[PDB]
Design an enzyme around this catalytic site. Structure first.
Site, PDB file in Angstrom:
ATOM      1  N   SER A 166       8.109  22.846 -11.641  1.00 13.98           N
ATOM      2  CA  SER A 166       8.126  21.417 -11.369  1.00 13.98           C
ATOM      3  C   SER A 166       8.836  20.922 -10.113  1.00 13.98           C
ATOM      4  O   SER A 166       9.878  21.440  -9.727  1.00 13.98           O
ATOM      5  CB  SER A 166       8.677  20.663 -12.570  1.00 13.98           C
ATOM      6  OG  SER A 166       8.514  19.272 -12.373  1.00 13.98           O
ATOM      7  N   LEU A 167       8.249  19.895  -9.502  1.00 14.73           N
ATOM      8  CA  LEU A 167       8.785  19.270  -8.300  1.00 14.73           C
ATOM      9  C   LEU A 167       9.433  17.939  -8.661  1.00 14.73           C
ATOM     10  O   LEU A 167       9.965  17.247  -7.798  1.00 14.73           O
ATOM     11  CB  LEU A 167       7.672  19.027  -7.271  1.00 14.73           C
ATOM     12  CG  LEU A 167       6.964  20.271  -6.729  1.00 14.73           C
ATOM     13  CD1 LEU A 167       6.043  19.862  -5.589  1.00 14.73           C
ATOM     14  CD2 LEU A 167       7.996  21.292  -6.235  1.00 14.73           C
ATOM     15  N   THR A 172       4.534  18.039 -20.073  1.00 17.28           N
ATOM     16  CA  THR A 172       3.440  18.697 -19.382  1.00 17.28           C
ATOM     17  C   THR A 172       2.879  19.808 -20.269  1.00 17.28           C
ATOM     18  O   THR A 172       3.250  19.921 -21.441  1.00 17.28           O
ATOM     19  CB  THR A 172       3.917  19.233 -18.000  1.00 17.28           C
ATOM     20  OG1 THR A 172       2.793  19.737 -17.264  1.00 17.28           O
ATOM     21  CG2 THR A 172       4.969  20.338 -18.176  1.00 17.28           C
ATOM     22  N   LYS A 180       1.449  17.845 -24.130  1.00 17.64           N
ATOM     23  CA  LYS A 180       1.025  16.454 -24.013  1.00 17.64           C
ATOM     24  C   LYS A 180       0.370  15.836 -25.250  1.00 17.64           C
ATOM     25  O   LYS A 180       0.417  14.627 -25.443  1.00 17.64           O
ATOM     26  CB  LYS A 180       0.152  16.296 -22.772  1.00 17.64           C
ATOM     27  CG  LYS A 180       0.930  16.668 -21.506  1.00 17.64           C
ATOM     28  CD  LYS A 180       0.392  16.008 -20.247  1.00 17.64           C
ATOM     29  CE  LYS A 180      -0.894  16.651 -19.780  1.00 17.64           C
ATOM     30  NZ  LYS A 180      -1.304  16.084 -18.451  1.00 17.64           N
ATOM     31  N   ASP A 238      -1.170   9.279 -15.388  1.00 17.88           N
ATOM     32  CA  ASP A 238      -2.268   9.888 -14.646  1.00 17.88           C
ATOM     33  C   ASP A 238      -3.156   8.888 -13.914  1.00 17.88           C
ATOM     34  O   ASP A 238      -3.247   8.912 -12.688  1.00 17.88           O
ATOM     35  CB  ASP A 238      -3.138  10.748 -15.573  1.00 17.88           C
ATOM     36  CG  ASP A 238      -2.502  12.097 -15.900  1.00 17.88           C
ATOM     37  OD1 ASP A 238      -3.153  12.909 -16.599  1.00 17.88           O
ATOM     38  OD2 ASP A 238      -1.359  12.350 -15.458  1.00 17.88           O
TER      39      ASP A 238
END
Ligand code: CL
Ligand code: CL
Lengths: 166, 278
Positions: free
Chosen positions: B17-18, B64, B68, B104
């Protein structure tokens, strides 16, 4: 890098100084981690500990009023902590939670080092807000050593604490 | 000193993850007492993790793969848009009550409008792929004033099912083959599939043969930063966009939901791009 999570479980915990000293110690030793504060209501201690394992939190200290409460939820408790019937330090070893109590050893060590004496004689006020400061720092350092395997600079921890308490 | 609030990401895995990169920098730039962490949660350990979030007082977490859907039963409430998509990627902990959202759709849309400086009014849009990665984008697009939102997918029946969940007045379903023949009928073309993504880079979602010059070709893939598909579209005179923006706005929307403050997206993009180019 992915930092590991540590913190203090108690109620209340918002004014704890453990984050101050632990985070400065992590950074000083280049340890990718951060110490947080977890306000756990009585009754959710069971969920908090199961939560620690499930979220993969590395370890947590336990202050009032859960030192006794967390015990039934651990996978192993140190004979010393058992005897005391209280845990102030928990470590998560790949899912297995082990409880320890560094409050005592911490008071002792801080005593003989701050007073430069040996208990072998007759063999201080733990309130810090001799001070209880030495104790706060040493019990934390013992916990820090259990988690990381490195003994932190207690003088620096004391210095940060004192400065803040003022 | 003030008590830092705890945020993070739950999933399996989570190390790639970022979000920490983006959120921790934003907390710092805005003077917010908080930190974003990574929490690996094994399938079947979700109930314990959510119970942990409540008990420990964790302020919020993103969700994630592959949780989800799995987290929903443990949430006190799920936003209507997320319920429709059928997935939650953002949870806010309101002093014990957990509410789930899905960024999203809006992430994609807001990034498209801003990065390409356009309004969706009267636009003829084609969405490629009918998977989970397309539901949010599809549903959010239906809420705009786009002229139409068509959908293409290798297995046409899946697209048909999704279109039925939609409008059907401004949206039709096609096979990839059909889509390629009528590719000229669109102002914006959006790839939501992973075709062309690392490491299988030498392939494209669909043929751009009938692509018109000056239209927009949007690919949500951001690794590589430029897919074979986007490159060819640029060569054909199209305006292009990769997925960096979507990723960033997904983060910003969750960030704002949690803090009440909109982070510096350009700064977030800058860090993200650097991390990706590294
Ligand atoms: Cl389906
Ligand atoms: Cl994305």
């Amino acid at each position: 890098h992915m930092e590991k999570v540590y913190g203090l479980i108690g109620f209340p915990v918002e004014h704890s100084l453990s984050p101050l000293m632990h985070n400065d110690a992590f950074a000083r030793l280049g340890i990718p981690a951060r110490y947080h504060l977890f306000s756990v209501e009585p009754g959710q201690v069971g969920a908090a500990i199961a939560g620690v394992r499930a979220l993969g939190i590395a370890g947590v200290n336990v202050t009032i009023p859960h030192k006794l409460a967390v015990i039934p939820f651990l996978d192993e408790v140190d004979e010393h902590a058992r005897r005391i019937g209280a845990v102030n330090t928990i470590i998560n070893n790949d899912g297995r939670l082990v409880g320890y109590n560094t409050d005592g050893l911490g008071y002792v060590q801080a005593l003989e080092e701050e007073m430069n004496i040996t208990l072998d004689g007759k063999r201080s006020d733990i309130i810090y807000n001799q001070n209880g400061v030495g104790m706060l720092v040493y019990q934390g350092a013992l916990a820090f050593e259990k988690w990381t395997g490195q003994w932190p600079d207690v003088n620096r921890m004391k210095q940060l604490v004192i400065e803040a308490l003022r």
